[PDB]
Design a protein around this nucleic acid. Sequence first.
RNA 1: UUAGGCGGCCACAGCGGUGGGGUUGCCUCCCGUACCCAUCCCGAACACGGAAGAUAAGCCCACCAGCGUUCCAGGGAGUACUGGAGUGCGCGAGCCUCUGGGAAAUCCGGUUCGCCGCCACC
RNA 2: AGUUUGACUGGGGCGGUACGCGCUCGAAAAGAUAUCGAGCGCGCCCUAUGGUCAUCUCAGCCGGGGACCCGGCGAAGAGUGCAAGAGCAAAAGAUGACUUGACAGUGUUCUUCCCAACGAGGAACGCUGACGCGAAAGCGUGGUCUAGCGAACCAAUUAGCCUGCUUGAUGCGGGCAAUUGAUGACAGAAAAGCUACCCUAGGGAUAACAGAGUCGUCACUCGCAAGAGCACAUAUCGACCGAGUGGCUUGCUACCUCGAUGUCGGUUCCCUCCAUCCUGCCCGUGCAGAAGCGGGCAAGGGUGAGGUUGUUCGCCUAUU
RNA 3: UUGAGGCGCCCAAAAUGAUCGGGACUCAAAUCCACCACCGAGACCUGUCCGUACCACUCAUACUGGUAAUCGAGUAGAUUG
RNA 4: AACAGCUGGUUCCAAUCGAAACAUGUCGAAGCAUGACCUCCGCCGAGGUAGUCUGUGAGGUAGAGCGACCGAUUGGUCCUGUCAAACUCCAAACUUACAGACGCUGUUUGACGCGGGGAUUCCGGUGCGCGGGGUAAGCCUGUGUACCAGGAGGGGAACAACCCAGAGAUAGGUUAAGGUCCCCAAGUGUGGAUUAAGUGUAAUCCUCUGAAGGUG
Lengths: 92, 186, 95, 154, 160
Amino acid sequence: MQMPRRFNTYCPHCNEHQEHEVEKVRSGRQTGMKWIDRQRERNSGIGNDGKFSKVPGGDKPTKKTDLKYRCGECGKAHLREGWRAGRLEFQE
Amino acid sequence: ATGPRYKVPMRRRREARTDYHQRLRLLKSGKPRLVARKSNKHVRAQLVTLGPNGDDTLASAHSSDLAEYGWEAPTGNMPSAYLTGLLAGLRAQEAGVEEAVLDIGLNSPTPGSKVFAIQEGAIDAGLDIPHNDDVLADWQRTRGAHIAEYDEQLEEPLYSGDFDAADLPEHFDELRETLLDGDIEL
Amino acid sequence: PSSNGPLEGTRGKLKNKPRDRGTSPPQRAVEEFDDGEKVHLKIDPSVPNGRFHPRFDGQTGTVEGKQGDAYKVDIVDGGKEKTIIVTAAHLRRQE
Amino acid sequence: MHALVQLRGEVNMHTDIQDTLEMLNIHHVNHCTLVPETDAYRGMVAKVNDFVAFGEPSQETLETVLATRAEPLEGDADVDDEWVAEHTDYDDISGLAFALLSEETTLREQGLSPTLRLHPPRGGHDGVKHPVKEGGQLGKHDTEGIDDLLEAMR
Amino acid sequence: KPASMYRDIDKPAYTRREYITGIPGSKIAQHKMGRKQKDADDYPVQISLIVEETVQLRHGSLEASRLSANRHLIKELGEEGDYKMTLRKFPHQVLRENKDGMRAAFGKIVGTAARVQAGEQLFTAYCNVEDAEHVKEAFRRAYNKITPSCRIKVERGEEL
RNA sequence: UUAGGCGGCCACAGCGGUGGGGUUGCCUCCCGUACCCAUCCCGAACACGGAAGAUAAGCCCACCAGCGUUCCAGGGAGUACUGGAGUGCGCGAGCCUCUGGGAAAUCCGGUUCGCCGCCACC
RNA sequence: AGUUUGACUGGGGCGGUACGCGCUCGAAAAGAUAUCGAGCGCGCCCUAUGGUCAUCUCAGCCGGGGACCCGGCGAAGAGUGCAAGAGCAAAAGAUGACUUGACAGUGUUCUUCCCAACGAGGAACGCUGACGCGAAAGCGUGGUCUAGCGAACCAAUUAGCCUGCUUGAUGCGGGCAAUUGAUGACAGAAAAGCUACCCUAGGGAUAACAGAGUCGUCACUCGCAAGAGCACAUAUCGACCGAGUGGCUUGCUACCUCGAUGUCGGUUCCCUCCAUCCUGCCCGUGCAGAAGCGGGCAAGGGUGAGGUUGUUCGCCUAUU
RNA sequence: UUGAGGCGCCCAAAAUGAUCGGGACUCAAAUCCACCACCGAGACCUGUCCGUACCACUCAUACUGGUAAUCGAGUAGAUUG
RNA sequence: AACAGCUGGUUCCAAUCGAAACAUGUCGAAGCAUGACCUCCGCCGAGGUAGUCUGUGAGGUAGAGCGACCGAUUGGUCCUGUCAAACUCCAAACUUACAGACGCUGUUUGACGCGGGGAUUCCGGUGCGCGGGGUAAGCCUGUGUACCAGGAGGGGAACAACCCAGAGAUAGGUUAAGGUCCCCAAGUGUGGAUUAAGUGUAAUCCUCUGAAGGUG
Ligand SMILES: [Cl-]
Ligand SMILES: [Cl-]
Ligand SMILES: [Cl-]
Ligand SMILES: [Cl-]
Ligand SMILES: [Cl-]
Ligand SMILES: [K+]
Ligand SMILES: [Mg+2]
Ligand SMILES: [Mg+2]
Ligand SMILES: [Mg+2]
Ligand SMILES: [Mg+2]
Ligand SMILES: [Mg+2]
Ligand SMILES: [Mg+2]
Ligand SMILES: [Mg+2]
Ligand SMILES: [Mg+2]
Ligand SMILES: [Mg+2]
Ligand SMILES: [Mg+2]
Ligand SMILES: [Mg+2]
Ligand SMILES: [Mg+2]
Ligand SMILES: [Mg+2]
Ligand SMILES: [Mg+2]
Ligand SMILES: [Mg+2]
Ligand SMILES: [Mg+2]
Ligand SMILES: [Mg+2]
Ligand SMILES: [Mg+2]
Ligand SMILES: [Mg+2]
Ligand SMILES: [Mg+2]
Ligand SMILES: [Mg+2]
Ligand SMILES: [Mg+2]
Ligand SMILES: [Mg+2]
Ligand SMILES: [Mg+2]
Ligand code: NA
Ligand code: NA
Ligand code: NA
Ligand code: NA
Ligand code: NA
Ligand code: NA
Ligand code: NA
Ligand code: NA
Ligand code: NA
Ligand code: NA
Ligand code: NA
Ligand code: NA
Ligand code: NA
Ligand code: NA
Ligand code: NA
Ligand code: NA
Ligand code: NA
Ligand code: NA
Ligand code: NA
Ligand code: NA
Ligand code: NA
Ligand code: NA
Ligand SMILES: [Sr+2]
Ligand SMILES: [Sr+2]
Ligand SMILES: [Sr+2]
Ligand SMILES: [Sr+2]
Ligand SMILES: [Sr+2]
Ligand SMILES: [Sr+2]
Ligand SMILES: [Sr+2]
Ligand SMILES: [Sr+2]
Ligand SMILES: [Sr+2]
Ligand SMILES: [Sr+2]
Ligand SMILES: [Sr+2]
Ligand SMILES: [Sr+2]
Ligand SMILES: [Sr+2]
Ligand SMILES: [Sr+2]
Ligand SMILES: [Sr+2]
Ligand SMILES: [Sr+2]
Ligand SMILES: [Sr+2]
Ligand SMILES: [Sr+2]
Ligand SMILES: [Sr+2]
Ligand SMILES: [Sr+2]
Ligand SMILES: [Sr+2]
Ligand SMILES: [Sr+2]
Ligand SMILES: [Sr+2]
Ligand SMILES: [Sr+2]
Ligand SMILES: [Sr+2]
Ligand SMILES: [Sr+2]
Ligand SMILES: [Sr+2]
């Protein structure tokens, strides 16, 4: 479906309606220094590694919308419930 | 009409006099309705409330009984409308009515119209009614100025009978002044 | 049933007889009830909003306050007490 | 006022029908009760119509049965004229029987068990598989019909 | 297939063609016989074949009986004799057969039948007083081809 | 209510038809665009201003039943169906009796051409 | 080397998914209700196809100049994203314009799960905040209603704050609230087969075989008698349709036995049934005779020997 | 001549020995319409006793008296002497 | 002394109450958990509602009908012939919410309700009514109810659920279903009619057959 790149809506920060900009959430890079990262190293040994021997699950036929809504005045973003959408293109 | 399965509209829908969808939204306020209605010659304002067997009019005013206070002019114009509203409004206050919502029936919400003039009249009588100032005609027109300036383009008196040649919005002032007065027999 | 949605098997009960078809009179959608009053529950096919679960048509509950313009009606489903949110459009005074 | 006598046992009878008989104070086969003719009572007997024998008894018959099978709310005590006189608002059985028939009082109000526990019908009854009109003993009876039964269950 | 399989009314009415497909055509060739341009009122005698038991009659039986009856009227009154006969019932009930054992047993469509209640007129013929015994004979042959016992009843007619 | 406004019930009120009614009164049609307002084009409508004319429309009053609808009597029908009971009948599908309920189509004769509430008003 | 390789199922396998959802019917006029029950859908799509307001009335038919224009009839058969059922006409539909409420926070209640406990999800109805449109009442918690959905752990993402072992600074961690990423076996394991070399626990809770119920199938009969039989229904043959009897075939069911009722065919030895192949006694004949064909009573007796094939069955030979 | 009803007859063939439980029965010991008198349960009525529950008295759950038409069957299982 | 959700077994008496063979979830269907239902204890303190009547409501199954929708379905030169589980202009019986009345019941037998302990149970079966599938079945799968299971005793030749009947002990009596020619307790009972086939002496039924057709 189509969607406006900018539009007026509620900013939970300013606490008043303002023009927001919508962006798709880009994946942040991992550091490899989280607790789970150390547990993988600690717990993996000879033979099977329990949970660390499992591999990536599958895919749902359609994914939900994953967006950031940025207030055009204070610059702070907020998140919203996504909705299933095969494709999402922004208008402008 | 055609058969068992045929669907005949509600009576007031056939007669084309009651917009039921508008009526519902109106009745939701829970307040009384300020029924503003027009005739080719007159203007009526009623304060209606809901009732077990039908509506209840607690107060009303008809442009005709406007003369009873000193009106010698026609009764199908702006000054006529405003005053009729004020009269009905005042009578409404007497009955204990404090607030209402404007019901204009099948008339159009045209800016500066008479139904809004009626509304402004009722509001001045002291009635609290949800309104919007910039949809109301500007004072002078309510006074009847638009009509006087029209008679200025004389050559032939606007009014047939003789109320006056150039007419008088001043008469409007006298009547209003008369109504806002405490005494007045309502 | 072959499905278990709220409207399963509601063909009859949620359909108007042809003559009662069309927008319903506003009078009953604005009626006012007092706490303690017995009210019959029956959805009006023509009125979309303010409905309760179809399974409850035919109940006669007790108004026990309201939420917004809708009413909170108490009933007893079999042996269990339940509170139903419903607008006047779907209610009628008992007796 | 009708006389109700259960002639068919509880085994296999609908529960709502059995509960009705219990509300009419009959809990056993051959137990009889006296019921006023009201719309409320009329429905009850109509529902039990197939497991009972009922009808309006004669003054005499009611008197015979009252003397022979009436009982105090509690105890063995015989219910004879003297008993009736020293315990009820009447002077003798006849006065009681008359008031019952005319529906002015009830066995309970007068300190009597609501139930008359009759004896099996001497000479047997007409059968519990058919109504009166078919030669059986079930359902509404003639005043002479009820009298024959009640007297036989003396 | 024996009629024992379908003669009774022991199933819901099954006639909705908007939900049933592949229904075999009817074997009944005609419902109006004799002189169909004439009226029934133009005759003094009117005899009907009445079914004595409620049943289902497969279109195969209707045709066989209708045939053996009208075929007799033709032989005895001519291919244009002065008479008219009517088969008033139509085979609306769709029949199935389960031809995997009792698994997914819902049968495939195999035919059609007419439901007739006891006491109804299956056939009604109209003739002249002369050909009254011929129509009675046509019916005798007709009821030998449909499940139930029947009554040959003379409605309009008292020349006895 | 010698014609009005707001309604409740929402065809007993619909469809169709006949007759009657208005000098400064009422509702209208009607007359007319400087204004408030208006037509994707039209003062048609909406809106505003107004009385030269009219009762032909609408409307209100009186009435007709052919169609549609509501209710009532008789007939169909205590039929069809049916809650309770049966060592009643039938090879059987099924039927009958007793008890408590009880239609629909349709025919026929009536009813129905709205009823009621609030306000205003020769 | 260790393991997995699911469940449902008229036994199991193959097929299928009735394994998560929605609608009509089944469903017996409250609610609830099963089957590998009947009809059929959903795992999306849409920035408008959402929201409001203004203006407006649709199918279809007719008349005048299957595009367009004018008039008339026209409660709804149009349209409303997609199953089905339902809702809707001064609208919930159409056109036009404006707008982003498809908003943030937090609840009540119902549903999911009738009754009656159970999560995610869903809906209705509120409040607080901020907005849109409208004269205003009011409408907007997405699409008129019922399908369009997903736990924990972990990661990424959003804004502020809490916190990391004597202590300060830095780095890098741990946490409160929430969004997104999938488990369709859809209240979530990470997962292929063979065994006739087999083994154990059990089951007649469940199949093979026999019995039993059924009788569609099979065998036999009867009713009607179209038809042909050179003419002639009925010497003889005999369609359609209709009604039955048997329990020999086959199928169905899963009642009986799985701590065991020994298989097919054959053989040997005994009893029986009649729907009769011969023999006895009869009727008809398209009965000259002879030889037949068909039918009736009738179960006393008889009904044999061989070639192929494990065969039952059947084919074939010579006798009778 | 024709209509209706009752009972029966034909249609009607199976395997160790026929059957309505058997004997056997014909103006019945069959069938249908009526009717009379009887037999026949642990049901119902009635005497005495037992248990259980409740009531009065009581420290008592020890006696004594009273009430039960509206108490007395029971697998799994809960409770108690 | 492996584990098993699988088979077998688990030892004294009595008194009170007394099931579930179903719903939701489950690698779950030979098992569990949570509910339903059984039982025990504590709390509460006046109502309760298995029956009926009436009032105020809910409902589209039976039936019926379709120039009332819808879709099927005849023929003739308006008429004439038929239907519907997924049709309805109509429309029951009946089921159901709430309230009052009568009944019954509860206030020392504490009901209704609340809180807590303990379960068992989640192979069911049959009759009747209503079903859906199937030619059918002592078939499969629903539903309401009563029964067997877990229910004696009387009757039915025998015989889980068909009839009577719900049962402490003992005793007398009278009946129920059913039966009265004998076997076998009671009639070779009464008035009247039919049947000549041993029809029949067979309520119900896997169990008792008997059909279409025909009969001076
Ligand atoms: Cl996205
Ligand atoms: Cl107006
Ligand atoms: Cl609800
Ligand atoms: Cl018991
Ligand atoms: Cl004999
Ligand atoms: K075995
Ligand atoms: Mg339905
Ligand atoms: Mg006593
Ligand atoms: Mg005796
Ligand atoms: Mg007897
Ligand atoms: Mg006129
Ligand atoms: Mg029988
Ligand atoms: Mg291991
Ligand atoms: Mg399996
Ligand atoms: Mg229901
Ligand atoms: Mg995981
Ligand atoms: Mg992410
Ligand atoms: Mg699951
Ligand atoms: Mg689930
Ligand atoms: Mg083994
Ligand atoms: Mg078995
Ligand atoms: Mg052996
Ligand atoms: Mg023979
Ligand atoms: Mg022999
Ligand atoms: Mg013990
Ligand atoms: Mg003891
Ligand atoms: Mg029907
Ligand atoms: Mg058991
Ligand atoms: Mg003897
Ligand atoms: Mg015999
Ligand atoms: Na470590
Ligand atoms: Na409506
Ligand atoms: Na298969
Ligand atoms: Na344009
Ligand atoms: Na006029
Ligand atoms: Na698995
Ligand atoms: Na939820
Ligand atoms: Na077999
Ligand atoms: Na057979
Ligand atoms: Na052998
Ligand atoms: Na022989
Ligand atoms: Na051979
Ligand atoms: Na026990
Ligand atoms: Na194990
Ligand atoms: Na079970
Ligand atoms: Na399970
Ligand atoms: Na298991
Ligand atoms: Na009471
Ligand atoms: Na029926
Ligand atoms: Na029992
Ligand atoms: Na016995
Ligand atoms: Na015999
Ligand atoms: Sr390590
Ligand atoms: Sr490793
Ligand atoms: Sr996938
Ligand atoms: Sr069937
Ligand atoms: Sr026949
Ligand atoms: Sr004009
Ligand atoms: Sr038969
Ligand atoms: Sr009546
Ligand atoms: Sr393996
Ligand atoms: Sr198989
Ligand atoms: Sr909505
Ligand atoms: Sr440190
Ligand atoms: Sr392979
Ligand atoms: Sr091998
Ligand atoms: Sr023979
Ligand atoms: Sr011979
Ligand atoms: Sr063989
Ligand atoms: Sr062969
Ligand atoms: Sr006992
Ligand atoms: Sr006991
Ligand atoms: Sr008990
Ligand atoms: Sr029902
Ligand atoms: Sr005798
Ligand atoms: Sr005799
Ligand atoms: Sr048997
Ligand atoms: Sr039989
Ligand atoms: Sr016969």
